[PDB]
Amino acid sequence: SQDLSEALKEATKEVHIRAENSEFMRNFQKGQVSREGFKLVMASLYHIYTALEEEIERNKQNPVYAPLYFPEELHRRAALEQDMAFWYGPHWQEAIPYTPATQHYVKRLHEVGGTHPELLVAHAYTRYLGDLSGGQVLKKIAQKAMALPSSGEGLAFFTFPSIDNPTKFKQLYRARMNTLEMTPEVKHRVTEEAKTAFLLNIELFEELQALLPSSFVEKMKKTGRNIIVFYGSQTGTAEEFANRLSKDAHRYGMRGMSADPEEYDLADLSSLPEIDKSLVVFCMATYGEGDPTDNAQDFYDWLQETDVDLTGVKFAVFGLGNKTYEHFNAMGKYVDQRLEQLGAQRIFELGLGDDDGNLEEDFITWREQFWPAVCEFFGVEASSIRQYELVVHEDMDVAKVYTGEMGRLKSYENQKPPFDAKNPFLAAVTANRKLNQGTERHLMHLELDISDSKIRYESGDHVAVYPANDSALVNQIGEILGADLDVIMSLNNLDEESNKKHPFPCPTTYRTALTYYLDITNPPRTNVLYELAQYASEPSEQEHLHKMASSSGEGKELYLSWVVEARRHILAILQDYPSLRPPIDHLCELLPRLQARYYSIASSSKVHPNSVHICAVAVEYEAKSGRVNKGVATSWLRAKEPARALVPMFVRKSQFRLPFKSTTPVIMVGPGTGIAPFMGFIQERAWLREQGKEVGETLLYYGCRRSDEDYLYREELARFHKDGALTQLNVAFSREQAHKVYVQHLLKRDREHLWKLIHEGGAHIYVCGDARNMAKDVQNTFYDIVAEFGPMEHTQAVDYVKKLMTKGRYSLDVWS
Ligand SMILES: Cc1cc2nc3c(=O)[nH]c(=O)nc-3n(C[C@H](O)[C@H](O)[C@H](O)COP(=O)(O)OP(=O)(O)OC[C@H]3O[C@@H](n4cnc5c(N)ncnc54)[C@H](O)[C@@H]3O)c2cc1C
Ligand code: HEM
Ligand SMILES: Cc1cc2nc3c(=O)[nH]c(=O)nc-3n(C[C@H](O)[C@H](O)[C@H](O)COP(=O)(O)O)c2cc1C
Numbered sequence: 001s002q003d004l005s006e007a008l009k010e011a012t013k014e015v016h017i018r019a020e021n022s023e024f025m026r027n028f029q030k031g032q033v034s035r036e037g038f039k040l041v042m043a044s045l046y047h048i049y050t051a052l053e054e055e056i057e058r059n060k061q062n063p064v065y066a067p068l069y070f071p072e073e074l075h076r077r078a079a080l081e082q083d084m085a086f087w088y089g090p091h092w093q094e095a096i097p098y099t100p101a102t103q104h105y106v107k108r109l110h111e112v113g114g115t116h117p118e119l120l121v122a123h124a125y126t127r128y129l130g131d132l133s134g135g136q137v138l139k140k141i142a143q144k145a146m147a148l149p150s151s152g153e154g155l156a157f158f159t160f161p162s163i164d165n166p167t168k169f170k171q172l173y174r175a176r177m178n179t180l181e182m183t184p185e186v187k188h189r190v191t192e193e194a195k196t197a198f199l200l201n202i203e204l205f206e207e208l209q210a211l212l213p214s215s216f217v218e219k220m221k222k223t224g225r226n227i228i229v230f231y232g233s234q235t236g237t238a239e240e241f242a243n244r245l246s247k248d249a250h251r252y253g254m255r256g257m258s259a260d261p262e263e264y265d266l267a268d269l270s271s272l273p274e275i276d277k278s279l280v281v282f283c284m285a286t287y288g289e290g291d292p293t294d295n296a297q298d299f300y301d302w303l304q305e306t307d308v309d310l311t312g313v314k315f316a317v318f319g320l321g322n323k324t325y326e327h328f329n330a331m332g333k334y335v336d337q338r339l340e341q342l343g344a345q346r347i348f349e350l351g352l353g354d355d356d357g358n359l360e361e362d363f364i365t366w367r368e369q370f371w372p373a374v375c376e377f378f379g380v381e382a383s384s385i386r387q388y389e390l391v392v393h394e395d396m397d398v399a400k401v402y403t404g405e406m407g408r409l410k411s412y413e414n415q416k417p418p419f420d421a422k423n424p425f426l427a428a429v430t431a432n433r434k435l436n437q438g439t440e441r442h443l444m445h446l447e448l449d450i451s452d453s454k455i456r457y458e459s460g461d462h463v464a465v466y467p468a469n470d471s472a473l474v475n476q477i478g479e480i481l482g483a484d485l486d487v488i489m490s491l492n493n494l495d496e497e498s499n500k501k502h503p504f505p506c507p508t509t510y511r512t513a514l515t516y517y518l519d520i521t522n523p524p525r526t527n528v529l530y531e532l533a534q535y536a537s538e539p540s541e542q543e544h545l546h547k548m549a550s551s552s553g554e555g556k557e558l559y560l561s562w563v564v565e566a567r568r569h570i571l572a573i574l575q576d577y578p579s580l581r582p583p584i585d586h587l588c589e590l591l592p593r594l595q596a597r598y599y600s601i602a603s604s605s606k607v608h609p610n611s612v613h614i615c616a617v618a619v620e621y622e623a624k625s626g627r628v629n630k631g632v633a634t635s636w637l638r639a640k641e642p643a644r645a646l647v648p649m650f651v652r653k654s655q656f657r658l659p660f661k662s663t664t665p666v667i668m669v670g671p672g673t674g675i676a677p678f679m680g681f682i683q684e685r686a687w688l689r690e691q692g693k694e695v696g697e698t699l700l701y702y703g704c705r706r707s708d709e710d711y712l713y714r715e716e717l718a719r720f721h722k723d724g725a726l727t728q729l730n731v732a733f734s735r736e737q738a739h740k741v742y743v744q745h746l747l748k749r750d751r752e753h754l755w756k757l758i759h760e761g762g763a764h765i766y767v768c769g770d771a772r773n774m775a776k777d778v779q780n781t782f783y784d785i786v787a788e789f790g791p792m793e794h795t796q797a798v799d800y801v802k803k804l805m806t807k808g809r810y811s812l813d814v815w816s
Helices: 004-020 023-029 035-058 077-087 100-115 117-131 135-147 166-179 184-210 216-223 237-247 266-271 297-304 330-342 359-378 471-481 510-517 526-535 539-547 553-564 570-576 584-590 632-638 672-690 714-722 743-749 751-760 774-789 794-806
Strands: 227-232 256-259 279-287 314-321 351-354 388-392 425-434 443-449 462-465 488-493 597-600 611-617 620-622 628-630 646-652 666-671 698-704 728-733 764-769 810-814
Touching: 004 023, 004 117, 004 166, 004 184, 023 135, 023 184, 035 077, 035 100, 035 117, 035 135, 035 184, 100 117, 100 184, 117 166, 117 184, 166 794, 216 266, 227 237, 237 256, 237 279, 237 314, 237 359, 266 297, 279 330, 297 330, 314 330, 314 359, 330 351, 351 359, 359 526, 388 584, 443 632, 443 646, 471 510, 471 570, 471 584, 488 584, 510 584, 526 539, 526 553, 526 584, 539 553, 597 611, 597 672, 611 632, 611 672, 628 632, 666 672, 666 743, 666 751, 672 698, 672 714, 672 764, 672 810, 698 743, 714 728, 728 743, 743 751, 743 774, 751 774, 764 774, 774 794, 774 810, 794 810
Parallel strands: 227 256, 227 279, 279 314, 314 351, 666 698, 666 764, 698 728, 764 810
Antiparallel strands: 388 488, 425 443, 425 646, 443 611, 462 597, 462 646, 620 628
């Protein structure tokens, strides 16, 4: 094609199929990889990436490669050195081999980097994009094939800690490649060089291959079990979840085991009701086009054409899936509905794990709410189960106690670089002023001083902040609970084979854990209610806490209506249920951890290198329980005054980026707080105009209610517009007349100019904000613009916009 990304993909179409169909790669996909061949390919990759990044640094400022210089995100030589130290011992330097094909690849890399840098892209692509695609799965295979530690040792080459979203980063990289200005003959040479790189990898793989040459029901009956957890897994994730679920069966009064439905025939499940209250749980991963895992095939087919009655069987299903597949969790949903229709009764709602989001936390949530449901559906053991042991340190020096820090002891005081999620930097609150002009809601512009923190950031990157719950809430909880909050204590995990030895940094006081470590504002989960049920003296409240710990009957309805809809925090529950008198150590054991909150950076580092600007709306509402609830992070930051008030924060890289060429036009859409990152963009753009660089058009599409209410940055945006930095300033006011006006209408208004920019000027579209379904609205608006002004059918216009998305030109930064 015309654009470099599409042209390279079309050129490598065939050699990619040939590469992934190489004998070694096919054996890798099936999981049949050996440690020796893996060491061989890893050493070869060490040599190859060393040569490649050597030439990259040699040409990191040559215009034929400069847009592709992402050392902090893509480079692999350090991770490959770590993996060589792992796989080849401490003296890996002299032990790793250097195969002839590896030498040929390195020689071609050096030839390119030395006398033909315009072709270097073709190699980088061939490697780096490839590492961001299949590489995410291969690791999950190796972790099981070679059995490596879960810490990722030996697989650091497959880990990109600075790439939060690999798909969006591949979009950005495609955009940077399309930035490369080149003659068509140079483009053809580049495609041929990408073919050459693929062929080098293919023959490397070829050479490396040349250097290699009973009834389960009656068994539970004969072993005394009542819980069995079948798993349908291919890369071990469902195995992990099923084994972790079986381990906790012995820790609730029952006992359970895992099971592979590839060695049993599940027709035996017909004779399962003959066990004194038993449960059958499935952890089913889905693959292909909604097809089951291989081991579950015999299961799946058996589910198809059968109707053997299994009345009395109690079951529960959890599905491992991924939202980006248009067959989401087909296997889990199928097993769930088929088991229901066959005559079994369900105990807990089917879980739908999302690999696109967070599968581990999803499974943790599902299990946390799952166990109390089974408990209160089968009866009770007086809730006689614990997880942490309390140890009170009545005499202890203060330099040994955690006072609120997140990483190492006293890390908040001896602040030493680097700073990240585990060691946040305590930024100084420079400014904290009100952006909102009215009185409906509070919107604030904070400035964090990170002067000597050595922290870098770009416009569009995010800043996360560790807040602290309101101290009045902590004091009230301590009073009503009748417990001393200044008691230095610790909670030690008695499950030895777990690195997680504490529910939060210990030793520390109950007050510190309630202020900085525990979320005491979000609605309580089912598990904490079922565990507090044993501390309710009145039966009219103990039975209420018991019923609110199940998925069936009036229980789930009452839980959703009284705790979820009303949004009652733990203090409100202790108030409305005066019988609850639990110990504070158990409450600390049960309460979830206080999470950090992210915000879009509202400043360009090119004009504010030692400060990070945040634009945030304060969360504060009247809950249906009468009580007024305050957002943790927003109120916490609002309380920060320049009279030194520190904020523990860190910076997470995002793929939201301005175009590399200053001449490229931008179309930013951000109603409300979604203006935050663009406030940075414009600044940088303005700065680029001050440096004498030719800057293209810059269009902003902001949206608010009334011009006198919540017009954010009105004066700054006006100054930007009159200085010429901001080309157009189109604001939609949703409450300034009869019919409301949104930014989609303003886009539809400027359809002709927008199309001319997109088609003739190669513009970049940006969308940001927490506005409801705003994404699809702007998306359909651009669909219609492209369909009309580019003589296109609707289908080809939607494909045009999705292509823009692929080329890294239609970017999103939405939240909720
Ligand atoms: C990448 C990313 C970027 C972000 N950028 C920004 C930004 O630039 N500016 C900004 O302000 N926020 C931004 N956010 C959101 C931010 O992280 C927080 O979610 C938000 O600021 C609230 O934080 P909080 O701790 O004060 O509220 P929390 O203590 O976390 O409570 C929030 C909960 O309160 C509930 N709630 C809120 N209002 C009501 C209501 N009327 N009635 C009933 N329930 C209600 C909701 O269920 C909500 O989930 C971003 C989030 C992400 C993931
Ligand atoms: C295990 C074998 C392999 C598998 C399963 C595999 C799988 C994939 C998949 C699924 C994609 C699409 C990702 C996307 O565009 O969203 C992809 C693209 C790609 N793969 Fe492969 N791949 C394999 C081998 C290789 C090898 C050996 C290389 C080169 C060293 C490579 C280079 C690429 C590149 C560069 C892309 C990006 C193409 C583009 O979008 O322009 N792949 N691969
Ligand atoms: C080839 C392949 C196909 C997949 N297809 C789907 C799918 O169709 N629907 C879905 O929800 N998830 C799909 N996934 C996501 C997996 O279900 C998800 O990664 C799951 O956690 C894997 O479980 P396991 O590692 O235990 O085998 C697919 C994954 C792969 C590698």
